[PDB]
Amino acid sequence: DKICLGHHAVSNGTKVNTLTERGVEVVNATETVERTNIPRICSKGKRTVDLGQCGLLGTITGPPQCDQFLEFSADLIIERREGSDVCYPGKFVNEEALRQILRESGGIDKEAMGFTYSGIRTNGATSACRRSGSSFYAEMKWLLSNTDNAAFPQMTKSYKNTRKSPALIVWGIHHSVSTAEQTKLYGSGNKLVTVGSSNYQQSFVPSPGARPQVNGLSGRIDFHWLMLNPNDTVTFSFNGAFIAPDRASFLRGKSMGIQSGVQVDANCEGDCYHSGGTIISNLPFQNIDSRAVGKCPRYVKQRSLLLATGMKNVPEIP
Amino acid sequence: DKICLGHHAVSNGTKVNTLTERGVEVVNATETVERTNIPRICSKGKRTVDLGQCGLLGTITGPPQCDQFLEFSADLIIERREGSDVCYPGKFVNEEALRQILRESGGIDKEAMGFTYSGIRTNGATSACRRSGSSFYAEMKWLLSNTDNAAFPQMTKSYKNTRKSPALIVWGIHHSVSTAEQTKLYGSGNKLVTVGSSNYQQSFVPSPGARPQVNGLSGRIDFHWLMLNPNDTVTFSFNGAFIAPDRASFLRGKSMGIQSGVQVDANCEGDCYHSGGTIISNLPFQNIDSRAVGKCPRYVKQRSLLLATGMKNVPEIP
Amino acid sequence: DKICLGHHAVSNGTKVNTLTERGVEVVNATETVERTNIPRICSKGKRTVDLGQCGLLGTITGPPQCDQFLEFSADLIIERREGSDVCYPGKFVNEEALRQILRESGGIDKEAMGFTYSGIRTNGATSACRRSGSSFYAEMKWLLSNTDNAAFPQMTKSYKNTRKSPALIVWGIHHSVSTAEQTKLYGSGNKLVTVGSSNYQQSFVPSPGARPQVNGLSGRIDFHWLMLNPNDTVTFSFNGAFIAPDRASFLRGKSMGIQSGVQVDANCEGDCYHSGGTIISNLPFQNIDSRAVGKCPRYVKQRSLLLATGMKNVPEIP
Amino acid sequence: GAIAGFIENGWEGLIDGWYGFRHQNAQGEGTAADYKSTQSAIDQITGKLNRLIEKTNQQFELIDNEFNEVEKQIGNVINWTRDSITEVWSYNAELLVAMENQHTIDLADSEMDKLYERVKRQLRENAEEDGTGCFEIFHKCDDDCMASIRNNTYDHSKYREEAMQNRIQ
Amino acid sequence: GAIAGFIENGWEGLIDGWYGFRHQNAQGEGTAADYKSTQSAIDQITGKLNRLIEKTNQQFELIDNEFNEVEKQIGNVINWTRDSITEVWSYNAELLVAMENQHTIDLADSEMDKLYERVKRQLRENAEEDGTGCFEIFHKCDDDCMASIRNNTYDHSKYREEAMQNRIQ
Amino acid sequence: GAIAGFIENGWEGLIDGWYGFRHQNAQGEGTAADYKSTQSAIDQITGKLNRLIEKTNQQFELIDNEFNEVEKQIGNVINWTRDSITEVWSYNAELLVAMENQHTIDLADSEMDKLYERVKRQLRENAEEDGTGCFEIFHKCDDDCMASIRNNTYDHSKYREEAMQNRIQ
Ligand SMILES: *[C@@H]1O[C@H](CO)[C@@H](O[C@@H]2O[C@H](CO)[C@@H](O[C@@H]3O[C@H](CO)[C@@H](O)[C@H](O)[C@@H]3O)[C@H](O)[C@H]2NC(C)=O)[C@H](O)[C@H]1NC(C)=O
Ligand SMILES: *[C@@H]1O[C@H](CO)[C@@H](O[C@@H]2O[C@H](CO)[C@@H](O[C@@H]3O[C@H](CO)[C@@H](O)[C@H](O)[C@@H]3O)[C@H](O)[C@H]2NC(C)=O)[C@H](O)[C@H]1NC(C)=O
Ligand SMILES: *[C@@H]1O[C@H](CO)[C@@H](O[C@@H]2O[C@H](CO)[C@@H](O[C@@H]3O[C@H](CO)[C@@H](O)[C@H](O)[C@@H]3O)[C@H](O)[C@H]2NC(C)=O)[C@H](O)[C@H]1NC(C)=O
Ligand SMILES: *[C@@H]1O[C@H](CO)[C@@H](O)[C@H](O)[C@H]1NC(C)=O
Ligand SMILES: *[C@@H]1O[C@H](CO)[C@@H](O)[C@H](O)[C@H]1NC(C)=O
Ligand SMILES: *[C@@H]1O[C@H](CO)[C@@H](O)[C@H](O)[C@H]1NC(C)=O
Ligand SMILES: *[C@@H]1O[C@H](CO)[C@@H](O)[C@H](O)[C@H]1NC(C)=O
Ligand SMILES: *[C@@H]1O[C@H](CO)[C@@H](O)[C@H](O)[C@H]1NC(C)=O
Ligand SMILES: *[C@@H]1O[C@H](CO)[C@@H](O)[C@H](O)[C@H]1NC(C)=O
């Protein structure tokens, strides 16, 4: 009579690594590094905007592409590569900082700044901003002299933020193709735009000159922005080449912004995103995208790291 | 007859975590994460300055608030929220880099730069810099024309650093409320200030324009700084709207700067600080402030991590 | 009769550390932290350039020092402290970003931009750029009026990148010692240089003024650069004080740049460098240089961390 | 036609447990699994699993842009920081798994010993070790007796006379 | 009114040591602590403590400002770096403590075994294991004899005849 | 002129192996090394070594300049990041080595036990432990018999009668 103590084993052994051995067989193991991707944006439970052709910064100035998003609201914001912040050729100064701000704004609430003008045209328009016919940015006013070559009077407009949150203020400087064109629009002489706050002070001059044609146009409108503290005021002194704002922006709350090139899905529920889709996993690590955002597992170089979930596999002596 | 081997146990067991179990009772444990804060700045053994109303950058230009600190010396430097670098409204360019420099300067040693002027007023003063009566920055000279609307002659002042350490040079550009005011002070025409070194080259223009009233004033003085290498020279060519320095600054040695809103204590001895006080601990980790500075334990998310200092607690069978 | 089981031991024991003990003797141990340095640059298998007196940025503009490197090619690029990007006193804007770009360029391929000029001198030269006699940057053209004090006509030159790779474009602004000198060179009046692309827009003004003499000269030429996208065009509108490029640069491929003050060796083969030499090691850690580059072991504070390669050493009872 | 326990081999036929008993008596050969040691091991492994499932509440947002590249200097600083951090987590992950697996394997062996040691202590002086993980029982152990061992109800006092007799001569 | 050692229970009455002896003879019941094994365990635990007390000489200074916020871009890069680093140290701390505690517990069990094994080897063939951490001594062991075991001066040769006699029959 | 095994002492004379046998019979004293346990331990240690030799393919380039210092703000951010990372790797290295060494030492002890346990199981009832890592063999074991133990060919059945006779009286 005889009694033996033993432990189970398989022929279906899977190799793992330890401190000492490399490829020691265990009975059972599981993966710790996610590689399984969902090529969609799982948006269930989250208010989502697919800006598409509307560049995120375009939601503030308002080219035609962004007309639907002028006062949008979201929990998740999706930028698209075909997006554009611009109709009339140009770019923001400190663009990326502004994007990072708007990506977690929860959307924007617009408010009239209430500027009034005299002895001046405000109907500045272009073929590039076609909305039915020639037009311009929806939240801005392209200011001209009055007739042609006429003198542009010095002006000084101010706006106070009477709200409990900081106000996104945006203005533009226009750079004509030539001094001949700058003169035709705003009259002769050097042009200066000054912008004053209570924690901000800058100065701006147009730079007329030949440039490559973008959208058929060699002129550039470069945008500038600041955040106006509550109860503080901004003041705009200028005498031409100035793109005045009509409204200010206020951040709605909290959101998250991503860039992607895949479709959205309102049935799937996720919280970790990259440009190629959504990562849903309880695994501690992932090997999909180093730049993945949201609440994600840590990114690693390795594609696989097997965790032993069973004892060492020792074959039976036949 | 019978002899048994055993180990001690308690009813006063404390739970800890391991690789496998969560909440396994051990006989004895200790905390590894500090949460105990001392709401004071333990300054014993360290020469300490509580700048109070004097902004750190104000120690260089010298508004009234910083008159006691014009040549201060310290091992520990404390900034206060009510601090201000300014009497006449304005701000430094590259302010934070400069703060970071002065926080470990060990204090400053000032030295006359020896500038002399002719056909010009140097008694520029303001109501904002009240020291008894109207005055100005202590280390600077506000230069004017001579009478009113009068022409400001072109000038060119230079200064060599004859010392073995780099010299902190600071100058200011004045931005008048109007071109009318700029003319009244420095005469008509465009104004240029050039600053030349042997590893630095910049240029500056005033930007006269309406701005909100700070301290009743709509004018701005924005400051600029550079570090002059030993035996190198700076040169100031200008024709108005220039805030000239009277003295240069030299760093005394080594120190540490903090921002805080709690009192100082000269009896307690510490080496790790945050805005809310001092952390004195031999524990490897802390959960008080992520931005804590000095020589500190590592910051962690968790408030508690118990380290077992005793065996597993196994209750006696009654 | 008696049989005993035992393990070996030595009198030559070496102390290591564990979780519990500090200085526990083991039979045998090995070092895990490299401290052994090779005070040479092991360049075997790698095409190597020792720029010497030629600053890396100088390879683009082409002072005399860099004439051998105007179209260099390398796998490894070595900067030297005596290096200089300049003959006529000045500096690049965004210099470090440009260096970082060129360090992994694999070298540069130059191409004529094909600019032609009329009613203007292009033979701008200086004593500082002596190449036989007075000369100038090899890839640039110093443009003047024509006689002296003469008017400099407005010009507008453009260049398209007809290649599949981005083009490094470099131009210069000249800052005369005086407006008197600026007038003598380019005529009277304010001078403007505009630079336009399809993702870039800037503007430039000369800042004439007295500066310290570098190489006997008080004038400064500060350089500016951009990357021109394939099939995109740059346009230069100007009326004086402009340092025009003659050729554009194209990146050859991939390389690595280091700064060092030690000789090169073509026999030794390495892949981890610092300014003091090469680190060749299979050890996981190193305590030589925190800024070491290439493929290196991790830098640590400790000079030594012994890994036990033998059992605990227990002396024999004598 | 002999049987052998742990020490050079596992049992591929043991399919209802991790650890178990295998015996042979007059009634033949039999194999049963031990619950307590099996569950203990399973509890410890799943314990590790739950620990590695503990998600983070740290949210991270975009710091650069893959449509419109940020400035070179700050862009290279970012890539340098992320790559450095990635190197750190890759190391941690590699070490964590390697360390865990070494422990999972060892605690599995540990449970085997404890079971063997328990049975040895049940049998007292009525059995001897064969050196293959088995015990040579020096008395008659029918299927009921074998079951008494498996459920820790084996009273060695009952068999002690018969056993020591057979052991001594 | 029996006594039992380790293996399902500790002793709450053992208050002058970590490991100890408990006996019963004609003179009654007694409990004493073992010094050597207790101190060894204490030396190892405090050893870990001193190791975790080893402070750093790395000084860190302010990189941002909580009165006057720095620029957004560089400010977000900083927060992103600090949060990433914080995630790393939080992980390290969690793992360090978990790993240490697992080892502290195991080395404590280890010391218990070593003590039990030592006593077993002292008694030779004069005792048998009861399976509760105790030894059944097959001879008269007065308080002096019990003390001889605790201080490793028990000469089994002295009791070997009387013991084997009582064990065999 | 006695001999002793592990448990308070190693053998400085054992120079051809890590673990070994030392005996004394009528033919005198002898010492031989055991191959299997020695190689197993060596395989595990070198296993760690190769693991720590696994180089990285992560390339890093210059992010600052030691000839011409970068701007203060971005320069301090860089130094702050590198120092923070350095603190992390220094910690990892310290912990890795400490953790490895603790394990290297323990697995070495483990191998010693396994060897001792194997020999104990070979000898069956023909020997007793002396408590110094040695076995008192209760029969004549010439050099050939000692060799039979070292190569696991010792048949205890051959010596069982003579042994139990000498053990009992
Ligand atoms: C080999 O190892 C894997 C990994 O542990 C084992 O698979 C695991 O099996 C358990 C139970 O079947 C799964 O638990 C499940 O949890 C989810 C979530 O609570 C629940 O919805 C399920 O109903 C189930 O209770 C566990 O998820 C699963 N792990 C994986 C990665 O699939 C497997 O059992 C092991 N092999 C053997 C033969 O035991
Ligand atoms: C439960 O665990 C804690 C943590 O180890 C034990 O408390 C510790 O007790 C020792 C000795 O009483 C303390 O050592 C001390 O060191 C300081 C600094 O050198 C010295 O000034 C003291 O005179 C003393 O020697 C140690 O600091 C203390 N740890 C803590 C966190 O208070 C405690 O003893 C354990 N419980 C039991 C019942 O042992
Ligand atoms: C004490 O520990 C050290 C570290 O393990 C031992 O030195 C090591 O010895 C081995 C074999 O002699 C060396 O392996 C070698 O590998 C290289 C590369 O493949 C090969 O070219 C050699 O021919 C040899 O096979 C190993 O490099 C070496 N390690 C070091 C750091 O030198 C040493 O043996 C130990 N002491 C004793 C007494 O065993
Ligand atoms: C609001 O602004 C006014 C001036 O416009 C100022 O006097 C006042 O202090 C500010 N704050 C409040 C709370 O009124
Ligand atoms: C000091 O400055 C002079 C010119 O001002 C220069 O010639 C000299 O090289 C510098 N250095 C020393 C050590 O004199
Ligand atoms: C090249 O440039 C021309 C204008 O110069 C433009 O029309 C065209 O789209 C560009 N790309 C290609 C592929 O021709
Ligand atoms: C950052 O890394 C990505 C990944 O390859 C690269 O494409 C990008 O160019 C890097 N950023 C910069 C500024 O080079
Ligand atoms: C950095 O983090 C702090 C902590 O909440 C936050 O208040 C601050 O706004 C962050 N910095 C920036 C630039 O957003
Ligand atoms: C970065 O660290 C090095 C190392 O000491 C130091 O020399 C340098 O000054 C630091 N950078 C800055 C901008 O201070």
What does the model show?
The complex is a heterohexamer, with three copies of chain A (318 residues) and three copies of chain D (169 residues). With 318 residues, chain A is mainly beta. Helices cover 6% and strands 37% of the residues of chain A. Chain A contains three helices and 29 strands. Chain A has helices spanning 58-61, 95-102, 179-186; strands at 2-7, 14-17, 22-26, 29-31, 33-34, 41-42, 48-50, 76-79, 108-112, 121-124, 126-131, 133-135, 140-144, 155-160, 167-175, 193-196, 201-204, 220-228, 233-238, 242-245, 247-251, 256-259, 264-265, 272-274, 277-278, 285-286, 293-294, 298-299, 306-308. In chain A, a hairpin with a 4-residue loop joins strand 16 (193-196) and strand 17 (201-204). Chain A is elongated. Chain D is mostly helical. In chain D, strands 1-2 form a two-stranded antiparallel ribbon. A two-stranded antiparallel sheet of chain D has the order 3-4. In chain D, a hairpin with a 4-residue loop joins strand 3 and strand 4. In chain D, helix 1 (35-53) packs antiparallel against helix 2 (72-123). The radius of gyration of chain D is 27 Å and the shape is rod-shaped. Classes of the chains: A mainly beta (318), D mainly alpha (169). Strand 1 (2-7) of chain C pairs antiparallel with strand 4 of chain F. A molecule of 3 linked components (NAG-NAG-BMA) binds next to loops of chain A. A molecule of 3 linked components (NAG-NAG-BMA) is lined by residues 28, 30, 309 of chain C. Chains A, B, C: GO terms for molecular function: host cell surface receptor binding; metal ion binding. Chains A, B, C: Ca(2+) binds at residues 71, 109-110.
